[PDB]
Amino acid sequence: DVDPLSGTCMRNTVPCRKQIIKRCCKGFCIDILKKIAKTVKFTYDLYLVTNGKHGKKINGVWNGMIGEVVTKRAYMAVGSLTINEERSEVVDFSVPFIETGISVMVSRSQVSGLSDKKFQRPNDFSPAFRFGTVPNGSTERNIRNNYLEMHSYMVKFNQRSVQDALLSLKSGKLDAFIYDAAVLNYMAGRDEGCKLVTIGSGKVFATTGYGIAIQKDSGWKRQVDLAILQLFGDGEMEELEALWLTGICHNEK
Amino acid sequence: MEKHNYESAAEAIQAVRDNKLHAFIWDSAVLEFEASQKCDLVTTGELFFRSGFGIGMRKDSPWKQEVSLNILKSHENGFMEELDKTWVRYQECD
Amino acid sequence: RLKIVTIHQEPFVYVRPTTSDGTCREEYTINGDPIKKVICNGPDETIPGRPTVPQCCYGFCVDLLIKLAREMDFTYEVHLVADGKFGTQERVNNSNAAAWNGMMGELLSGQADMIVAPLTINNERAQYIEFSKPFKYQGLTILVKK
Numbered sequence: 475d476v477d478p479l480s481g482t483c484m485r486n487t488v489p490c491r492k493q494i495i496k497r498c499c500k501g502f503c504i505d506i507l508k509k510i511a512k513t514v515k516f517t518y519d520l521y522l523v524t525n526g527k528h529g530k531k532i533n534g535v536w537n538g539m540i541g542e543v544v545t546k547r548a549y550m551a552v553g554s555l556t557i558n559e560e561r562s563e564v565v566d567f568s569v570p571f572i573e574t575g576i577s578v579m580v581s582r583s584q585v586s587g588l589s590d591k592k593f594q595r596p597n598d599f600s601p602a603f604r605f606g607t608v609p610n611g612s613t614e615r616n617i618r619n620n621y622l623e624m625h626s627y628m629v630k631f632n633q634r635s636v637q638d639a640l641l642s643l644k645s646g647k648l649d650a651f652i653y654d655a656a657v658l659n660y661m662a663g664r665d666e667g668c669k670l671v672t673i674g675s676g677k678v679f680a681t682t683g684y685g686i687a688i689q690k691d692s693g694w695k696r697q698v699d700l701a702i703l704q705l706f707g708d709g710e711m712e713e714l715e716a717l718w719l720t721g722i723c724h725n726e727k
Numbered sequence: 728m729e730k731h732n733y734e735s736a737a738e739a740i741q742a743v744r745d746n747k748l749h750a751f752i753w754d755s756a757v758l759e760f761e762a763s764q765k766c767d768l769v770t771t772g773e774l775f776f777r778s779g780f781g782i783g784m785r786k787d788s789p790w791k792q793e794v795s796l797n798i799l800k801s802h803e804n805g806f807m808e809e810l811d812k813t814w815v816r817y818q819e820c821d
Numbered sequence: 822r823l824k825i826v827t828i829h830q831e832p833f834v835y836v837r838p839t840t841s842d843g844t845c846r847e848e849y850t851i852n853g854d855p856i857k858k859v860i861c862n863g864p865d866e867t868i869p870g871r872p873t874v875p876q877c878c879y880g881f882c883v884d885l886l887i888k889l890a891r892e893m894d895f896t897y898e899v900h901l902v903a904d905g906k907f908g909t910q911e912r913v914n915n916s917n918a919a920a921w922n923g924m925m926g927e928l929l930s931g932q933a934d935m936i937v938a939p940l941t942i943n944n945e946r947a948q949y950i951e952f953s954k955p956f957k958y959q960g961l962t963i964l965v966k967k
Contacts (some may be wrong), residue, residue, distance in 0.1 A: 559799040562954075573958075620804060677806055681958070701946055737830075739935065743964055756939055757960040760832040769967040774960025778943065782953035783928050783936035789937070790895070795954035797892055806888070807956060812833065813850055814881045 490546075492522035502718040503684075506571065506705065507552050514694065515699040528555060530610045540565065543687045551687035556612040556654065566690065567701050570683020571711065572719075574656035576613050578605075580649065580675035588674060596627065605650040606631025608639060613652070616680065643670070656684070656719070663721010671724070730753070734777035743768055754782070759815070825886065825899040826848050826924040827861065827878070828907050833939045834880040836863070836901075859883055863901025873903060878888070878893035882937045885956060902927055907940055925950075 476483050476498045479671050487500040488508065497519065511518060525536030539555070542548035542552075543565055556574070557567055585592055596603040609612050609632045617623040631648065633639035642648035651658075655678040662672045688695060692727065704713055731748070733739040740761055742748035742818055755774050755784045763817075782798075784791035839845065845858035853934055865874035878899065890897055908925030912918060920926045925934045925940075928950065936941035942952050 555797075559796070559803050563796060616803060678802070682802075683772050700944065711730065731950065734896065740964070743895070744965060746966070749965065751964040752961060753964070754941070755962045756832060756965055758829065758962060759959075768964050769964045770964055772962055772964055778905030778941035779937050779943045779958035781955045783940060784934075784951045784953065785928065786935070787949040788951070790893075791951045791953055793893060797879055797889055798954045798956055801885070801888065801894075801940070801956070807916065810881055810884060810903035811957070813852060813854075816851065 479614065488520060489521050493524055497522060502714060503552055503554070505714060505718075506720045509705055509710070510698065510701045513704060514697055518696075526610065528553075528611060529561060530562065531615065536564075540687065543689065545701070548687070548691070548695075549689060554654065554657065554684060558612050558616065559684045561687075566688040566695060567685035567691060568688070569702055570685060571702060571705070572656055572683050573681070574654055574684060575682045576616070576652065576680045577655035577658045577676060577678045579643065579651045579658045579661060579670055580673060581654065582668060583673065584650070585673065588679070593624065594621070595623070603650075603671035603687070604631055604648045605652055605654045606633055606639065606642065606648065608633060612655070658723055660719055663719075663723045665723055666722075668723045668726065671727075677719050731733075740768070763816050763818065763820050769820075822840075822933050823895050823936055824933040825897055825931070825937050826854070826902045826927050827863075827880075827882065827899065827936075827938040828902060828905065828924055830939050833882045834878060836949050837877050839875065839877045857884055857887065859897075859899055860874050860888075861899045861901050864903050871903075873900070876901070881941070892898075898905065900933070902933075907938060908946075 476487070483498040484498075488499040488504055488602060490497050490499040496580065499522075507518075510539070523539045523542065525541065529536060529538035529540030531537075532680065536544065539548060539551035540561060543551050556569065561567070578588075592599065592603070593602075593605065606628050607617075614625065614632075619629070633642055637654065639651055639653070643651045655672075655676065659672060659676055662676070669680075686698070688698070693721065736753070736757060739751050740752065743751045744765065744767065754776075755770065758770055762768060773780060782791075782794060784794065829836055836847070839860065844860070846856070848856045850856055858877055861876050861878035862873050863876055864871055865876075865877075867874075878901065883899075886897060886899075889895070889926055902924035903921045904926075906923040908921040908923030910921040920929060924933065924936055924938065925946065928936050939957075942955060946952075
């Protein structure tokens with residue numbers, strides 16, 4: 475929220491509007507967008523999504539930013555958006571800038587195989603086990619696609635928001651949490667106490683990266699992609715990683 | 728690095744194995760499999776000069792459009808994970 | 822038809838000659854499965870001269886290729902590139918002369934229409950050709966005895 479006395483956004487923050495009010499968006503993705511735009515030299519308008527957050531297929535119809543990409547209300551959608559076959563099918567995606575994916579975040583008390591099926595069934599273990607993830611996610615859709623039982627069981631353990639999901643992990647009443655690997659790693663690094671850690675080496679299955687939406691085969695397309703690898707090409711991403719992504723935790727281990 | 732260069736991969740791994748050379752630098756995909764193969768030798772640090780592999784096609788050929796479309800479909804189901812699991816043994820090392 | 826080209830890289834490709842006329846071994850993966858295999862024509866250093874030699878090749882990339890082949894309408898015939906190198910720009914000064922030596926060069930030349938191998942993906946190459954989404958992704962590292 476921008477300083478009311480100032481009346482307009484400050485520093486790195488770039489304006490974004492949400493139909494319901496001007497909100498000020500800033501961060502890693504914002505800086506990357508700014509650099510890409512700077513390199514390709516174009517101007518752009520940024521706003522916030524209302525309906526359905528991250529893109530989701532419900533029954534026949536899609537939701538989220540992807541809708542505004544399909545409705546041509548957005549040309550390109552930017553964010554923490556993960557990549558999947560369906561969305562790559564409907565819209566062309568930028569190359570992944572960061573190593574991420576599905577992953578687990580748990581307290582120091584579990585799955586070395588990490589496919590051990592201890593997750594597959596809670597019931598095999600006499601005490602009830604617990605793990606959950608945020609709904610309407612690429613993670614949840616993927617889960618439902620490959621592993622049904624896990625979805626049907628985890629619906630009870632689904633949580634409202636990442637801060638709240640964190641509330642279920644942190645205060646007890648939940649054992650394990652599952653979410654995006656970049657977010658889980660940054661949260662591993664950033665915690666009020668170093669009470670939370672990643673799973674194994676944090677080496678994630680469903681190895682993926684964050685992409686960016688475009689309409690279809692007709693688009694600025696390749697021009698974007700080049701820009702992206704110029705960003706790492708000059709080594710900026712490492713600096714931006716140290717500033718935005720690097721957490722203080724996990725130094726110790 | 729230019730000093731004391733080796734001609735081929737086998738000789739380069741051998742030097743470290745022979746202990747002729749204390750360290751060897753190469754991309755992981757060739758190296759990690761060997762790391763599993765001996766375990767007398769180890770890989771260290773974080774992959775740098777990160778580069779992803781892929782199947783080459785001319786821009787003019789549209790089949791690649793399906794290929795990527797297929798590649799992604801192969802990623803989601805964990806087909807790749809099981810294939811790396813098969814071909815990376817992975818038998819003895821830690 | 823698809824002409825496919827590869828290079829001899831140990832993890833993702835293996836080379837053994839077909840025993841006499843007989844084709845491929847029933848050798849089995851550590852997880853009990855029979856190993857799949859296909860025929861590939863490639864450079865042989867075994868003979869003093871270098872003939873393009875009929876060979877048997879089996880690999881991760883091969884299993885992937887056949888996986889595609891069941892998924893995709895295509896049929897495949899594979900021969901390894903004559904040069905051991907995948908590819909690099911080289912050769913004469915005037916205008917731009919020749920072309921990068923190696924399997925990539927075969928791709929532009931059309932000797933093979935598609936390249937299946939462990940190839941890192943980079944911009945210098947990228948302008949010349951289309952690149953499939955990465956099946957894998959690795960980087961450089963160092964080996965030292967434990």
